[PDB]
C-alpha cells in the first residue's frame, strides 16, 4: 500500500553558507525508506544537490483529511520511455489522494508498460470544480442521475446441483 | 437406512512431492467437507485409517487397517498431511480414507 510522505531536507551547513535552504517535497512510497530515496533522486535530478552533502531533516506521513467524501484528483507525471521524454495529465475519481496514485500507477503499467522508477509525479491537486474536469468519464460520473446495471463479477464447493441464478 | 459412520470420509491424493521427487513418508489427504487451511485445523491430530480387504483371512477377519495421524494442513484448499504407521501404497491414490473424531478437544 502506498503512503503519502512529506519529506523535508537540506544540505549540511558549512563555512561557505552558515544557514542552508530548506526543501520540502510530497511523494508517495510504501515505506519511509523508499520515500527518502526517491526524495534524494529528485533533488539531485533538480537542484543538483548531492545526497552525501545533504540530509533528511523531517519525514511525516499524511492521511486523507476527508476520506469519506468522493473527490476528483488531477495528476501530472513525467515518463521515461524509449524516447525518454513525455508528460501527461490524468484525472481519477476516488476518496483518497493515495488511492488515485495507486490507480494511476495501475493504468500506466497496464497501457504503457511503465515502472515505478520512471514515473516522477510533479503534482497532485484535487479538482473540486465540475467544469475544470477534462475527462468525459468523470463528467459522466458527475451527473445527478447515476444509476447503472451491475458489472459482471464472474464469481471449493464444486458440482453445484442447480443452475446458478447469475442475476440481480 | 442409517449406518454408524462415526468418522469423516477422506481421499488419498498423492505423496508429499516436488515436480520430480516423491516422499512417501508423508501423504496428502483430502478430508472432504474441509475447504480451507483454517478449517483443516480442526482435523489436526485426529486418527486417520486406511481400511482395505485381503482375500486371505487372519483370525477369521478379512479386513486390514493401516493407522495414521493428521499432522498439518497442506495448501490453501484444506488438504492435510498425514503420516501412517506403514507408508501408504502408491496404488491407493484416489482411495478412500476414514478420519476419526478422536482424539477430541470439543
Amino acid at each position: 500500500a502506498l503512503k503519502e510522505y512529506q519529506v523535508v531536507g537540506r544540505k549540511v551547513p558549512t563555512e561557505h553558507e552558515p544557514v542552508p535552504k530548506l526543501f520540502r517535497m510530497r511523494l508517495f512510497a510504501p515505506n519511509e525508506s523508499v520515500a527518502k530515496s526517491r526524495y534524494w533522486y529528485f533533488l539531485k535530478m533538480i537542484n543538483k544537490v548531492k545526497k552525501a552533502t545533504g540530509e533528511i531533516v523531517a519525514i511525516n506521513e499524511i492521511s486523507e483529511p476527508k476520506p469519506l467524501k468522493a473527490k476528483v484528483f488531477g495528476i501530472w507525471i513525467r515518463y521515461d520511455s524509449r524516447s525518454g521524454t513525455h508528460n501527461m495529465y490524468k484525472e481519477f475519481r476516488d476518496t483518497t489522494r493515495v488511492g488515485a496514485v495507486e490507480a494511476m500507477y495501475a493504468d500506466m503499467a497496464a497501457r504503457h508498460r511503465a515502472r515505478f522508477r520512471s514515473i516522477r509525479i510533479l503534482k497532485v491537486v484535487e479538482v473540486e470544480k465540475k467544469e475544470d474536469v477534462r475527462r468525459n468519464y468523470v463528467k459522466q460520473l458527475l451527473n445527478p442521475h447515476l444509476k447503472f446495471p451491475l458489472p459482471h463479477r464472474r464469481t471449493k464447493k464444486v458440482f453445484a446441483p442447480h443452475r446458478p441464478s447469475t442475476f440481480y | 437406512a442409517q449406518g454408524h459412520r462415526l468418522y469423516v470420509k477422506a481421499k488419498h491424493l498423492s505423496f508429499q512431492r516436488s515436480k520430480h521427487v516423491i516422499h512417501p513418508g508423508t501423504s496428502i489427504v483430502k478430508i472432504e467437507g474441509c475447504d480451507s487451511k483454517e478449517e483443516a485445523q480442526f482435523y489436526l491430530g485426529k486418527r486417520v485409517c486406511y481400511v482395505y480387504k485381503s482375500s486371505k483371512a487372519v483370525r477369521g477377519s478379512k479386513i486390514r487397517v493401516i493407522w495414521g495421524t493428521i499432522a498439518r494442513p497442506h495448501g490453501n484448499s484444506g488438504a492435510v498431511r498425514a503420516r501412517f504407521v506403514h507408508n501408504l501404497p502408491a496404488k491407493t491414490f484416489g482411495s478412500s480414507l476414514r478420519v476419526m473424531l478422536y482424539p477430541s478437544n470439543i
Partner: protein, 97 residues
C-alpha cells in the same frame, strides 16, 4: 480425548456419592490362582468370571438418583437412548455440538 462433550442441559449428579469410584474400583482383578499341575492346568477345566452383585448394587443406586433428574427435563430419556451418528453432508468442524 475419546469423548465429545455435547452442550445438552446438565444433569443433577451432586445427589449421588462418587467416592467409591477410584482407580482400584475399576482396576482389573489380579490374574492369580495357585492352579496345581494337571486338572485345569493341563486338562483345561478353567473357571469363569462374573460381575459381582456389589458392582450391580452400586449401579442400581446411581440410576435411582439419576432417573428423576433426566425425567424432569423433556427428551433427556429419549436422547440418551439414541446413538449419535453422522449423516450425509455433516461437517464436524462447522456444526456445533
Amino acid at each position: 480425548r475419546y469423548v465429545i462433550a455435547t452442550s445438552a442441559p446438565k444433569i443433577d449428579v451432586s445427589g449421588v456419592s462418587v467416592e467409591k469410584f477410584t482407580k482400584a474400583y475399576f482396576a482389573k482383578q489380579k490374574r492369580s490362582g495357585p492352579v496345581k499341575k494337571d486338572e485345569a492346568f493341563f486338562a483345561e477345566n478353567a473357571p469363569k468370571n462374573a460381575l459381582p452383585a456389589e458392582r450391580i448394587a452400586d449401579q442400581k443406586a446411581v440410576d435411582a438418583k439419576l432417573l428423576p433428574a433426566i425425567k424432569a427435563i423433556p427428551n433427556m430419556k429419549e436422547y440418551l437412548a439414541a446413538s449419535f451418528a453422522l449423516s450425509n453432508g455433516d461437517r464436524p468442524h462447522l456444526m456445533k455440538f
